[PDB]
Amino acid sequence: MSKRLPPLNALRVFDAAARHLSFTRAAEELFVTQAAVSHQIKSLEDFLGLKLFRRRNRSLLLTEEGQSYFLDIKEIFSQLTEATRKLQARSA
DNA sequence: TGCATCCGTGAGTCGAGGGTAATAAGGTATTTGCTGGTAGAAGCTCAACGGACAATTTATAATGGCTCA
């Protein structure tokens, strides 16, 4: 069974969506456009089947459907960036 | 002109078992000839690496809606 992992892009914008509280401001930190955020939520939804946020006026709140899947994203990028540091540091 | 004398001929499809034997010497030395064995060519063959192209992703461009005070 081929292990269909989540896309390499939807995960990082998902962490900055909660911190920045705004989707437009979530794109300036990742030097991308705001339209790229909505492109990747659907592809990752194929595995989840749960909606990631609940709409609020001029605000972004947390829903339990996507909340379970927040807790298994923020540690992936932490260690891989650490991983980049280790080879780079030992190379020097 | 008569005499032995020699030389081919004398059917054919079919079946079954189907092949045997009187006998003969030992040396020497030299020479030839093959046969596996073991090393060289040589001849692949699987396993890693370098250099163009296209199905698939992504992000970039708008576009048109869903929301409170």
Swiss-Prot record:
Source species of the chain: Escherichia coli (strain K12)
Molecular function GO terms recorded: DNA-binding transcription factor activity; sequence-specific DNA binding
Annotated signal peptide: none
Coiled coil: none
Annotation: DNA-binding region: 23-42
Function: Regulatory protein for the glycine cleavage system operon (gcv). Mediates activation of gcv by glycine and repression by purines. GcvA is negatively autoregulated. Binds to three sites upstream of the gcv promoter.
Location(s), subcellular: Cytoplasm
Transcription recorded as keyword: yes
Protein name listed in UniProt: Glycine cleavage system transcriptional activator
One Gene Ontology term, aspect cellular component: cytoplasm
Family according to the record: Belongs to the LysR transcriptional regulatory family.
Biological process annotations from GO: DNA-templated transcription; regulation of DNA-templated transcription; response to UV
Main location: cytoplasm
Alphabetic keyword roster: Activator, Cytoplasm, DNA-binding, Repressor, Transcription, Transcription regulation
Residues of the HTH lysR-type domain: 6-63
